[PDB]
Amino acid sequence: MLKIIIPTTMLLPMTWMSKHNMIWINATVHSLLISLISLSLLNQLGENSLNFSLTFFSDSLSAPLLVLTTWLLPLMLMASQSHLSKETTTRKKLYITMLILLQLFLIMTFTATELILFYILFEATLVPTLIIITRWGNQTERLNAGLYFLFYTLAGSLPLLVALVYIQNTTGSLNFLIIHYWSHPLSNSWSNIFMWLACIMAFMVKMPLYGLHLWLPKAHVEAPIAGSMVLAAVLLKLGGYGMMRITTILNPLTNYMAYPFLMLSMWGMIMTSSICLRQTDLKSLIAYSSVSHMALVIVAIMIQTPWSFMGATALMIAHGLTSSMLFCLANTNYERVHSRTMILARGLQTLLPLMATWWLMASLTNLALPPSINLIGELFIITASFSWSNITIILMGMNMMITALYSLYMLITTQRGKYTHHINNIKASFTRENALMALHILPLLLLTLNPKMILGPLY
Amino acid sequence: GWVRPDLGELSKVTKVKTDRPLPENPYHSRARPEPNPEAEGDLKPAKHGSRLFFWTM
């Protein structure tokens, strides 16, 4: 699988040795090239995963993530074109290195064949993002933003490490294939429930879980524009991809003690969606809506119904995209006005009509309107939950109450309505914003026509 | 009929032809512990290399 790994490793000499003017022209022109190279990984067998080597392998679950990450990397490049034009060239090369290194650690992480190799490359991603969030951030609190990020993720990461080595000494291998074939029932002993607690709370923290979610509002809001998309789009989803992987040996204790988490997600998803409708900062909305959708997929894995694993993958990519346009859009209002208050800028179609067109179709994508894979994945979660419990619908049905209650709400107060006559700052839309808008939303309608590949391994 | 021993002459170490049997176990030593299992064979490459975590070699 070094088809994709090495050219990204080499991309660091590429950007570092590139000339003064190109750099970003260089950075994109080859990151797109790597994207179609990673588009090859769409070749799955039925159920036997693509085992490329002893340490690297991929399956129907990992591959959609790989294409998401690799194709994402050009997007923050062009997204960061505006924000970081003033800075000198050397840090420009360093910033791209952080982006490439981040995507580098992502692709190996999703493709590791040994659990600890996944873990070492799991939390290896906070190191570059901590640099991105803290150094290149904009507002003052960004200092405390990074601390909240790493400490939250680490507070659960270390228990996983102690658990992982324990399984190594107990079973003899943490490799996905061996642990899957030699999967054994995790008994109900108090020792084993804490083992389950160790192997789950790590992903739950950066899931996030209701109550264990403060980092995203304190990080995504003050993260740099490029950094903000990457966190929500994919760096949310390491825990998820790990979660469906480690859940092969935690049975049957999962069906017995997932209730507190199924609780905290269900109430949290309504709670997060409701508070999402009542923030004064637009950037907090995509952050709070993100966890609301993200709280949904934790429900999927807990019931571990085949249908639940169906929508877990689809919603992951769907939301992972969905947060991307909104953060891109929410960015576009910011630097134009140097504020993230939706109240300050209202009715932008009277000034930016094309931006509004992109705004609404991303919004209705967040609405989970079929045939978009946002709904079908999200819908499969509903069906699995009903199989788990018929009553489940009402609490989550309350989530199909708040989403559109806010997901069109900023539309009618950011892109829709009248304009304040004092902001002459608002200007025409540079084609970059619409162009990246095109590569952002056009895919989601494209693979909508063909949902089986991003459906997941349960096909 | 005696001779005065010369200086150093009397201090010479001497041999005695006693007929007493040799003390087989003068210290009354018991059986001693057997040695550890010795090392033998030839050094062959370690199976699957280091075998530590994910390191294939």
Automatic annotation (TrEMBL), chain B:
Indicate, by first and last residue, each region the UniProt record lists as having compositional bias (Basic and acidic residues): 31-45
Location(s) in or outside the cell: Mitochondrion intermembrane space
Segments for region (Disordered) = 18-49
Per the record, the domain of life is Eukaryota
Q: What does the UniProt record say this protein does?
A: Accessory subunit of the mitochondrial membrane respiratory chain NADH dehydrogenase (Complex I), that is believed not to be involved in catalysis. Complex I functions in the transfer of electrons from NADH to the respiratory chain. The immediate electron acceptor for the enzyme is believed to be ubiquinone.
Oligomeric form and interacting partners: Complex I is composed of 45 different subunits.
The family annotation for this protein states: Belongs to the complex I NDUFA8 subunit family.
* Name this protein carries in UniProt: NADH dehydrogenase [ubiquinone] 1 alpha subcomplex subunit 8
Annotated source species: Sus scrofa
Q: What is the lineage of its organism?
A: Eukaryota, Metazoa, Chordata, Craniata, Vertebrata
In terms of the whole protein, what range is present?
192 to 248 of 248
